[PDB]
XYZ file of C-alpha atoms in Angstrom:
8
model
C 0.754 60.654 40.358
C -0.218 62.587 43.675
C -1.208 60.275 46.346
C -0.232 56.864 47.773
C -1.670 53.437 48.105
C -0.419 51.734 44.793
C 0.463 53.967 42.168
C -0.532 57.309 40.287
């Protein structure tokens, strides 16, 4: 959701 490097 918040971040990067894959998902979220």
